[PDB]
Amino acid sequence: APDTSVSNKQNFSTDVIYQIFTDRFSDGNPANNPTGAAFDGTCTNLRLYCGGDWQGIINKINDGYLTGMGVTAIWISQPVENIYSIINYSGVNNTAYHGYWARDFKKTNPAYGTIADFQNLIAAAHAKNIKVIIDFAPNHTSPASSDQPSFAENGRLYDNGTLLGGYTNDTQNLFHHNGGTDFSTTENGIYKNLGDLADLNHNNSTVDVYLKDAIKMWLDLGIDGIRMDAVKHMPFGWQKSFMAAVNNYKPVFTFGEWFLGVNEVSPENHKFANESGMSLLDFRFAQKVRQVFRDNTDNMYGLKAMLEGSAADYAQVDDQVTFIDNHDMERFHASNANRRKLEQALAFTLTSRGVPAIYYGTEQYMSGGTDPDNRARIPSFSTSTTAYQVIQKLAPLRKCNPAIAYGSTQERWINNDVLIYERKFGSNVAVVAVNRNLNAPASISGLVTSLPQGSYNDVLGGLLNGNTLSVGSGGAASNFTLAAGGTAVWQYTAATATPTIGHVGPMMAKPGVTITIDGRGFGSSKGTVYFGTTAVSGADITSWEDTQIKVKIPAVAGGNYNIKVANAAGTASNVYDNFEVLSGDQVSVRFVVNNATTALGQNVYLTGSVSELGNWDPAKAIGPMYNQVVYQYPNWYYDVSVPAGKTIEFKFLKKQGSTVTWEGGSNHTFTAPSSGTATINVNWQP
Ligand SMILES: OC[C@H]1O[C@H](O[C@H]2[C@H](O)[C@@H](O)[C@@H](O)O[C@@H]2CO)[C@H](O)[C@@H](O)[C@@H]1O
Ligand SMILES: OC[C@H]1O[C@H](O[C@H]2[C@H](O)[C@@H](O)[C@@H](O)O[C@@H]2CO)[C@H](O)[C@@H](O)[C@@H]1O
Ligand SMILES: OC[C@H]1O[C@H](O[C@H]2[C@H](O)[C@@H](O)[C@@H](O)O[C@@H]2CO)[C@H](O)[C@@H](O)[C@@H]1O
Ligand SMILES: [Ca+2]
Ligand SMILES: [Ca+2]
């Protein structure tokens, strides 16, 4: 099938996501609605259930609402069984309508539906070419109080109705018993509770295995992607081990939530996105779009910087999920603000790099502050708004114009208020002009593009006051005026004659797994795929088309590789880098080193005998290690993903800048478990 097909669970770049809060979309089946003091059919009390379900979702899909808009994927609330307790948070009653308070991951939330409802959901969606994504939140169970076992459901965890354990008297130690985090350090928000939420302990085998098994069920249910909650609050290594489990079974596009504040830029965030096996919600894009188009606290120059920098910081920028708002911020649209801002920001996001996500009700200009305020019931299914039409006109271009889905980004004109960018992929080009100034037009002269000579109509049809464009020879545009609040899109498409790789997924897996290579100009006859210098052809290439290739990863040694393709005639493609070949199935192991005392600005790292550990390369060492919560300095710890059942040799080191100090003696040695987790404790050899 082509790259754009609904069946492509590895690439969401040509798609447009619609983020839905199940409870607040549509109640197609009142019968499953909760009753009593947990329900509010008026949905005036934003903390109880309003009754939205899967059925309601099916209904909107079938009656043309989402399809009419151009949406091609839907992202919904965590489907698992939540707690039933109404929780009084100082006079206010709170229900689990949000689905973030899990009690059993192998069961559904009856307020949303039955498994059969779920299966119908996927069916209906699929039938209409819409992919399905679900939230997944393995960091915790529910709000619990260690000495007030009667409070809520005491963070109890079940396994398909079977009681695993509770927060009080946690002998098995399923949970963390370290107190609450003050979000002070990365280490602090990982090993402590998020408020009163029962913190799961990924280091306990039971927990480890339970979670890995739970996600398979859903995978077996046919989901197209997973949205991970609180990735920044769980151990990185465990998460990488989780990714491996998914990818080594049934790979699906996975993205996590790692909140970034205004003007915040984190290297940890980059690294996670680059090596964990999942991509992230592009908080950096979001924050910056808001400042520029909404709060007006930065200008075009700032957008431009975020664009060029992110491109450099993320190994796979096109896998970052963009948006303008979501359930964790106030609605972009403000009561009394000019709608044109929300419109401009939608246009922008839609034609920009990444995977655009639209928060339900945006197209309806919903207003609302922070939680619970940004979680109201969509008040209407009108296709008549300007926003609905914007999406409707742009969304489809992600499928038909590869420049938009996979192209580079390039600034071609700019000032404080204006920004003209060019996207390019093969013989495809898209040019976008935005004039944030709602009061002043701009004189546009000196514009050069890669567009062929000719005239171009605004793809928006003038909806946002766009205009036509006249490109002369040399792609130089003739002078024009860009109306105040003006937005225009122009484009050029044509066949690509040379193999050009636009995307790869999954990006990390063991040999034998089939990966997906999307692009253009691959031709129709099988060619060759290169993993590094190793060539793959024939049978192992399970399928080959012009825009997509499916191939089994050869049994090469664990590591990082570049991928490349060559057509049947031997013409080679561009290189796609950063593919990680695992050394085998993975397990999560806690490494602990005793008495490794450092000096300031000097940390301990870990390295060893396998690719998962850097292969003795200090530039690729794991770390820096943690040292405050679980184990206190001078003891250091760290949760690492390693090849299951393999015998491994390792050593700790002290780095400072790029200046290294090795532990003395001989490598330590250990054999990873076949499954479950383990804890290796040793002392620093001087
Ligand atoms: O002529 C190519 C030139 O076009 C754009 O420069 C603009 C500039 O952004 C505007 O602020 C204004 O000064 O007009 C210039 C065109 O004369 C690209 O930004 C620039 O890099 C490029 O060289
Ligand atoms: O908190 C992590 C911190 O640990 C290391 O610093 C040690 C320092 O070397 C010791 O002499 C002692 O004063 O305790 C510090 C930890 O609290 C790393 O040197 C440092 O970079 C790192 O942030
Ligand atoms: O370079 C591969 C080599 O790396 C490690 O050797 C360290 C050694 O442990 C240190 O004491 C120090 O002398 O630097 C060596 C790196 O050149 C592993 O110990 C070793 O097995 C491996 O071959
Ligand atoms: Ca219902
Ligand atoms: Ca945690």
PDB file of C-alpha atoms in Angstrom, residues 91-186:
ATOM      1  CA  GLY A  91     -15.626  20.270  48.933  1.00  0.00           C
ATOM      2  CA  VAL A  92     -15.336  19.409  45.275  1.00  0.00           C
ATOM      3  CA  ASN A  93     -16.361  16.090  43.863  1.00  0.00           C
ATOM      4  CA  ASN A  94     -14.082  14.656  41.201  1.00  0.00           C
ATOM      5  CA  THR A  95     -14.665  11.592  38.990  1.00  0.00           C
ATOM      6  CA  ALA A  96     -12.205   9.763  36.721  1.00  0.00           C
ATOM      7  CA  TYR A  97     -13.851  11.087  33.579  1.00  0.00           C
ATOM      8  CA  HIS A  98     -10.403  11.880  32.182  1.00  0.00           C
ATOM      9  CA  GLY A  99      -9.328   8.202  32.347  1.00  0.00           C
ATOM     10  CA  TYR A 100      -5.963   9.048  34.038  1.00  0.00           C
ATOM     11  CA  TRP A 101      -6.779   7.038  37.199  1.00  0.00           C
ATOM     12  CA  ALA A 102      -6.230   3.369  36.260  1.00  0.00           C
ATOM     13  CA  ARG A 103      -7.276   0.423  38.313  1.00  0.00           C
ATOM     14  CA  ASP A 104      -6.820  -2.405  35.824  1.00  0.00           C
ATOM     15  CA  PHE A 105      -5.156  -2.170  32.427  1.00  0.00           C
ATOM     16  CA  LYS A 106      -6.810  -5.226  30.926  1.00  0.00           C
ATOM     17  CA  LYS A 107     -10.319  -3.998  31.166  1.00  0.00           C
ATOM     18  CA  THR A 108     -12.239  -1.111  29.708  1.00  0.00           C
ATOM     19  CA  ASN A 109     -13.930   1.845  31.404  1.00  0.00           C
ATOM     20  CA  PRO A 110     -17.609   0.901  31.226  1.00  0.00           C
ATOM     21  CA  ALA A 111     -18.583   4.581  30.943  1.00  0.00           C
ATOM     22  CA  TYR A 112     -16.813   4.631  27.527  1.00  0.00           C
ATOM     23  CA  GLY A 113     -18.000   1.193  26.478  1.00  0.00           C
ATOM     24  CA  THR A 114     -17.372  -2.501  26.268  1.00  0.00           C
ATOM     25  CA  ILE A 115     -14.608  -4.210  24.387  1.00  0.00           C
ATOM     26  CA  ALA A 116     -17.130  -4.825  21.694  1.00  0.00           C
ATOM     27  CA  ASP A 117     -17.799  -1.115  21.618  1.00  0.00           C
ATOM     28  CA  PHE A 118     -14.064  -0.653  21.285  1.00  0.00           C
ATOM     29  CA  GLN A 119     -13.769  -3.108  18.408  1.00  0.00           C
ATOM     30  CA  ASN A 120     -16.553  -1.287  16.623  1.00  0.00           C
ATOM     31  CA  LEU A 121     -14.757   1.875  17.145  1.00  0.00           C
ATOM     32  CA  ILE A 122     -11.684   0.673  15.418  1.00  0.00           C
ATOM     33  CA  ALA A 123     -13.738  -0.819  12.632  1.00  0.00           C
ATOM     34  CA  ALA A 124     -15.762   2.241  11.860  1.00  0.00           C
ATOM     35  CA  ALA A 125     -12.658   4.401  12.021  1.00  0.00           C
ATOM     36  CA  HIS A 126     -10.711   2.167   9.745  1.00  0.00           C
ATOM     37  CA  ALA A 127     -13.543   1.978   7.308  1.00  0.00           C
ATOM     38  CA  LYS A 128     -13.401   5.669   6.986  1.00  0.00           C
ATOM     39  CA  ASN A 129      -9.606   5.836   6.684  1.00  0.00           C
ATOM     40  CA  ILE A 130      -9.118   7.206  10.125  1.00  0.00           C
ATOM     41  CA  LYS A 131      -6.315   5.906  12.381  1.00  0.00           C
ATOM     42  CA  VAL A 132      -6.828   5.364  16.109  1.00  0.00           C
ATOM     43  CA  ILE A 133      -4.555   6.416  18.926  1.00  0.00           C
ATOM     44  CA  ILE A 134      -4.992   5.949  22.558  1.00  0.00           C
ATOM     45  CA  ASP A 135      -3.641   7.425  25.676  1.00  0.00           C
ATOM     46  CA  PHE A 136      -1.501   5.109  27.882  1.00  0.00           C
ATOM     47  CA  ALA A 137      -0.472   6.074  31.391  1.00  0.00           C
ATOM     48  CA  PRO A 138       1.749   3.423  33.045  1.00  0.00           C
ATOM     49  CA  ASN A 139       3.288   5.806  35.606  1.00  0.00           C
ATOM     50  CA  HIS A 140       0.708   5.268  38.228  1.00  0.00           C
ATOM     51  CA  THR A 141      -2.619   3.927  39.337  1.00  0.00           C
ATOM     52  CA  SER A 142      -4.866   6.335  41.279  1.00  0.00           C
ATOM     53  CA  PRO A 143      -4.793   8.900  44.058  1.00  0.00           C
ATOM     54  CA  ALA A 144      -3.993   7.066  47.233  1.00  0.00           C
ATOM     55  CA  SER A 145      -3.308   7.748  50.876  1.00  0.00           C
ATOM     56  CA  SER A 146      -0.954   5.353  52.607  1.00  0.00           C
ATOM     57  CA  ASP A 147      -2.615   5.666  55.972  1.00  0.00           C
ATOM     58  CA  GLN A 148      -6.160   6.301  54.909  1.00  0.00           C
ATOM     59  CA  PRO A 149      -6.748   3.119  53.003  1.00  0.00           C
ATOM     60  CA  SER A 150     -10.377   4.060  52.880  1.00  0.00           C
ATOM     61  CA  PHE A 151      -9.453   7.102  50.732  1.00  0.00           C
ATOM     62  CA  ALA A 152     -10.446   6.451  47.151  1.00  0.00           C
ATOM     63  CA  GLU A 153      -9.554   2.939  46.092  1.00  0.00           C
ATOM     64  CA  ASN A 154      -6.145   3.202  47.869  1.00  0.00           C
ATOM     65  CA  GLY A 155      -4.317   3.128  44.445  1.00  0.00           C
ATOM     66  CA  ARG A 156      -5.270  -0.553  44.068  1.00  0.00           C
ATOM     67  CA  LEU A 157      -4.090  -2.413  41.042  1.00  0.00           C
ATOM     68  CA  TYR A 158      -5.795  -5.305  39.374  1.00  0.00           C
ATOM     69  CA  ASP A 159      -4.992  -7.617  36.654  1.00  0.00           C
ATOM     70  CA  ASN A 160      -8.142  -8.506  34.858  1.00  0.00           C
ATOM     71  CA  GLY A 161     -10.248  -8.393  37.962  1.00  0.00           C
ATOM     72  CA  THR A 162      -7.518 -10.028  39.940  1.00  0.00           C
ATOM     73  CA  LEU A 163      -6.254  -7.969  42.886  1.00  0.00           C
ATOM     74  CA  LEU A 164      -2.579  -7.323  42.640  1.00  0.00           C
ATOM     75  CA  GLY A 165      -2.166  -4.999  45.553  1.00  0.00           C
ATOM     76  CA  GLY A 166      -2.781  -1.698  47.246  1.00  0.00           C
ATOM     77  CA  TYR A 167      -0.916   1.351  48.321  1.00  0.00           C
ATOM     78  CA  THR A 168      -1.289   0.578  52.014  1.00  0.00           C
ATOM     79  CA  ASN A 169       0.742  -2.419  53.305  1.00  0.00           C
ATOM     80  CA  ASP A 170       2.606  -2.581  50.029  1.00  0.00           C
ATOM     81  CA  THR A 171       4.688  -5.604  50.891  1.00  0.00           C
ATOM     82  CA  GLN A 172       5.211  -6.771  47.296  1.00  0.00           C
ATOM     83  CA  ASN A 173       6.419  -3.213  46.801  1.00  0.00           C
ATOM     84  CA  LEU A 174       4.525  -2.579  43.678  1.00  0.00           C
ATOM     85  CA  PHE A 175       4.572   1.144  44.409  1.00  0.00           C
ATOM     86  CA  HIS A 176       7.125   3.786  45.396  1.00  0.00           C
ATOM     87  CA  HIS A 177       7.126   4.846  49.031  1.00  0.00           C
ATOM     88  CA  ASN A 178       9.351   7.912  48.846  1.00  0.00           C
ATOM     89  CA  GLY A 179       6.930  10.795  49.380  1.00  0.00           C
ATOM     90  CA  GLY A 180       5.849  13.464  46.886  1.00  0.00           C
ATOM     91  CA  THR A 181       7.992  15.208  44.267  1.00  0.00           C
ATOM     92  CA  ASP A 182       8.646  18.900  44.293  1.00  0.00           C
ATOM     93  CA  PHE A 183       9.353  18.744  40.559  1.00  0.00           C
ATOM     94  CA  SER A 184      12.850  19.977  41.725  1.00  0.00           C
ATOM     95  CA  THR A 185      15.012  17.642  39.693  1.00  0.00           C
ATOM     96  CA  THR A 186      14.482  15.073  37.030  1.00  0.00           C
TER      97      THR A 186
END
